[PDB]
Amino acid sequence: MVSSYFKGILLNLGLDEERIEVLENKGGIVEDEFEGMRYLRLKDSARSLRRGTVVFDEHNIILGFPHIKRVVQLENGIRRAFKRKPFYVEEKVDGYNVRVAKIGEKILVFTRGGFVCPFTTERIEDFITLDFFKDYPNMVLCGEMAGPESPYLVEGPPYVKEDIQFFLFDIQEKKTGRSLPVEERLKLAEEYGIPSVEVFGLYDLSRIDELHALIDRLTKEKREGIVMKSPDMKKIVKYVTPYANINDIKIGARIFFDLPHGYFMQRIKRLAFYLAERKIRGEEFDEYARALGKVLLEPFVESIWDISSGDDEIAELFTVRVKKLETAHKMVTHFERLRLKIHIDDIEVLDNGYWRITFKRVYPDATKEMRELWNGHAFV
Amino acid sequence: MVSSYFKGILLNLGLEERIEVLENKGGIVEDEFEGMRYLRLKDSARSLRRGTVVFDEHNIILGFPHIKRVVQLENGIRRAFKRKPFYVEEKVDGYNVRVAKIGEKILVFTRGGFVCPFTTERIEDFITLDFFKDYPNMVLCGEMAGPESPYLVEGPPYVKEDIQFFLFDIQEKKTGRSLPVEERLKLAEEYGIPSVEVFGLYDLSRIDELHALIDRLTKEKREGIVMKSPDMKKIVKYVTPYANINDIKIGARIFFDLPHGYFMQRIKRLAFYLAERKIRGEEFDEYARALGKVLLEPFVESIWDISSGDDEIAELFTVRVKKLETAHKMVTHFERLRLKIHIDDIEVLDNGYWRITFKRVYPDATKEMRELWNGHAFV
Ligand SMILES: [Mg+2]
Ligand SMILES: [Mg+2]
Ligand SMILES: [Mg+2]
Ligand SMILES: [Mg+2]
Numbered sequence: 160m161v162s163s164y165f166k167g168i169l170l171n172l173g174l175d176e177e178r179i180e181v182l183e184n185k186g187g188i189v190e191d192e193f194e195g196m197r198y199l200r201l202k203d204s205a206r207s208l209r210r211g212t213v214v215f216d217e218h219n220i221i222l223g224f225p226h227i228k229r230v231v232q233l234e235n236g237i238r239r240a241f242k243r244k245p246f247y248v249e250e251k252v253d254g255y256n257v258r259v260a261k262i263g264e265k266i267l268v269f270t271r272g273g274f275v276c277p278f279t280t281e282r283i284e285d286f287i288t289l290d291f292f293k294d295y296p297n298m299v300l301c302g303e304m305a306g307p308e309s310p311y312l313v314e315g316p317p318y319v320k321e322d323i324q325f326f327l328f329d330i331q332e333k334k335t336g337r338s339l340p341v342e343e344r345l346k347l348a349e350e351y352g353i354p355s356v357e358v359f360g361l362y363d364l365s366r367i368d369e370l371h372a373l374i375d376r377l378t379k380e381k382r383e384g385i386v387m388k389s390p391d392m393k394k395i396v397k398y399v400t401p402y403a404n405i406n407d408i409k410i411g412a413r414i415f416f417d418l419p420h421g422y423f424m425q426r427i428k429r430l431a432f433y434l435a436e437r438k439i440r441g442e443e444f445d446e447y448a449r450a451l452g453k454v455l456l457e458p459f460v461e462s463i464w465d466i467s468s469g470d471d472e473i474a475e476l477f478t479v480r481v482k483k484l485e486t487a488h489k490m491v492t493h494f495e496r497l498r499l500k501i502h503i504d505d506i507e508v509l510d511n512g513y514w515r516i517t518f519k520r521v522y523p524d525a526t527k528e529m530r531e532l533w534n535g536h537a538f539v
Numbered sequence: 540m541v542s543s544y545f546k547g548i549l550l551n552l553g554l555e556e557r558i559e560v561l562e563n564k565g566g567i568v569e570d571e572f573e574g575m576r577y578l579r580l581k582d583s584a585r586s587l588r589r590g591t592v593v594f595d596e597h598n599i600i601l602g603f604p605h606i607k608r609v610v611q612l613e614n615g616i617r618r619a620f621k622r623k624p625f626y627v628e629e630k631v632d633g634y635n636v637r638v639a640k641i642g643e644k645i646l647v648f649t650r651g652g653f654v655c656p657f658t659t660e661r662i663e664d665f666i667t668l669d670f671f672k673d674y675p676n677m678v679l680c681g682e683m684a685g686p687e688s689p690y691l692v693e694g695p696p697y698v699k700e701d702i703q704f705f706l707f708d709i710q711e712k713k714t715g716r717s718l719p720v721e722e723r724l725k726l727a728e729e730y731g732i733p734s735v736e737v738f739g740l741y742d743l744s745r746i747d748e749l750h751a752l753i754d755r756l757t758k759e760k761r762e763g764i765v766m767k768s769p770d771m772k773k774i775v776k777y778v779t780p781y782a783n784i785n786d787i788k789i790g791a792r793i794f795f796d797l798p799h800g801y802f803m804q805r806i807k808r809l810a811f812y813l814a815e816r817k818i819r820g821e822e823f824d825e826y827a828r829a830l831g832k833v834l835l836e837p838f839v840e841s842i843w844d845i846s847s848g849d850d851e852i853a854e855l856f857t858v859r860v861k862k863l864e865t866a867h868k869m870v871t872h873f874e875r876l877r878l879k880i881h882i883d884d885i886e887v888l889d890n891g892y893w894r895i896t897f898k899r900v901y902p903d904a905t906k907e908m909r910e911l912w913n914g915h916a917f918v
């Protein structure tokens with residue numbers, strides 16, 4: 160299933176031969192390839208090797224990016240995680256996660272599951288300079304790709320007016336995955352001109368009222384929230400705005416079916432805890448209640464009306480810019496391997512010579528369930 | 540674990556290897572009420588649904604079948620009934636009971652096959668027993684519904700106190716076969732058995748009057764309808780937007796540890812009603828405000844509750860009983876069902892009945908809600 164070459168490295172990393180075989184049998188480790196380079200991808204977690212870890216050889220091991228725990232009550236979440244000790248507060252940028260690393264003679268960009276993104280890898284030199292990897296070839300840039308022309312999202316931060324951008328939020332060591340302290344990472348980002356998430360400053364529990372004011376401002380500005388980090392990067396907690404929760408519901412409600420478990424309920428819970436913590440009442444409360452009802456029902460009702468007349472499927476349209484037409488071809492192939500039903504809907508050349516590719520992703524299982532229900536299917 | 544007497548009947552009913560798996564896994568269990576032992580089917584086995592109870596070779600009470608719902612009324616009718624006629628009955632919001640003569644006793648069973656000590660002791664208050672003198676092999680299936688219920692905190696608006704029985708089926712022992720609608724209604728009248736309201740005989744061509752009926756039931760805070768072919772072979776339910784919104788209001792006080800999809804299924808049902816009826820503008824906005832309010836207001840109120848104090852999320856509800864012993868039997872029964880319920884208040888009514896106020900607490904929902912309020916971090 161997977162070569163003993165890769166199993167050999169997993170052993171040198173301390174993994175047990177018996178565990179390696181179980182992972183191989185269950186598909187928890189799989190082989191993949193990008194432009195001729197073979198690598199092992201961890202679909203499941205293995206000891207200190209997180210999901211999304213990729214292995215090319217004994218040195219080129221890129222650990223998966225760790226999950227970040229959330230709090231839904233900000234003040235008490237800070238007291239529990241940080242006590243009264245200081246922490247950095249960074250913008251949580253709404254995009255997709257990437258890890259950028261020098262592998263052999265190539266710069267590869269890995270998405271969260273450990274796939275090489277052909278779009279982001281081809282265009283990485285538009286978003287960052289590569290001087291960093293000349294000096295720090297054993298280091299991994301971790302960041303968010305975010306913007307209005309994204310291959311993976313249909314929303315983004317409001318200050319990105321076109322195309323897509325990189326926002327550094329961590330620098331990690333190969334093989335160990337160890338994060339540099341915040342201050343060192345920011346010094347490297349400035350030294351190399353690497354675009355960074357916005358750092359709002361150093362805060363602590365005693366400054367909770369300013370943090371609430373920050374959340375309210377990010378809400379009005381249609382931004383997602385914050386990530387709180389101890390200076391040594393050992394404690395990390397996220398917290399999202401009510402806008403993030405309401406807009407996610409709006410986007411998701413067009414599809415409604417076949418979404419991750421709890422997608423809607425978790426966000427309703429996050430809204431209720433925000434409303435409780437901030438003691439919002441009266442007319443202000445009613446505005447949130449009306450907004451929640453609207454984003455649950457209006458996009459869903461609109462899709463029911465759509466699927467009730469015709470053979471059209473529920474779809475999302477999105478665009479990206481590419482330098483070479485071949486890249487668009489590589490994306491369609493990549494989208495299929497990821498089991499997504501995506502095709503090219505439109506192509507245009509821009510005034511700067513980039514191709515603007517409009518993709519259409521359809522949701523056939525969600526469409527089928529919605530249409531069967533509309534056509535009167537009876538269920539227990 | 541389970542007697543060879545009961546396993547023998549299960550075999551005579553068509554179930555031998557499956558019987559042993561059921562015994563080992565606890566899918567069939569033995570129970571007892573006032574000295575009568577019976578087998579209860581905790582899981583379904585072939586044509587024997589969950590809630591089937593077995594006392595002997597003859598006294599077999601089949602579990603009540605699930606009823607499929609439609610969320611799009613006009614197309615659901617076209618699919619289920621085509622253009623053939625069907626009866627339309629009120630769906631009464633209560634709990635399901637099966638009433639049967641077992642030996643010399645009249646026992647009342649809830650959906651899972653437990654004898655309800657409350658409904659069994661008081662059954663003569665809700666129905667007459669003449670029916671079982673003439674039809675001892677028949678089972679009355681009905682809804683117990685009202686403002687003083689042991690199992691619900693809502694009920695139909697036209698029941699002003701206590702609780703009432705509403706007949707909706709008459710089934711044969713052992714076979715579970717339902718009598719045709721017209722025959723069940725004639726029996727209900729002959730024996731004075733209270734019935735669910737029958738709105739009449741409808742068909743697809745009368746879909747606009749059915750919509751008008753739904754709108755009236757919503758305005759009157761009633762749950763919906765059950766549609767039945769005259770031979771009882773095709774049965775479909777459809778609930779009002781009020782039922783969906785009020786269920787959410789009730790559930791949102793607790794939010795956690797509820798059945799999977801409890802909220803999402805009702806939002807789905809709300810959306811299909813709004814689509815089918817082409818509701819728009821201000822009328823649409825009223826439904827969106829109502830949905831937002833019932834999701835958030837009870838939930839926020841409970842967060843405020845658990846944030847100031849050490850109290851647990853609780854529901855208060857009352858019932859009337861004739862004997863205090865009955866209240867004692869209910870507390871014991873509630874514990875056996877793994878519910879944290881205790882007696883909060885007791886009073887004697889002007890008619891000599893005891894009104895018992897129970898308090899059910901929700902320790903698992905309370906703990907999760909409180910941990911979240913106290914800043915617990917989670918993936
Ligand atoms: Mg994100
Ligand atoms: Mg979002
Ligand atoms: Mg019911
Ligand atoms: Mg109800």
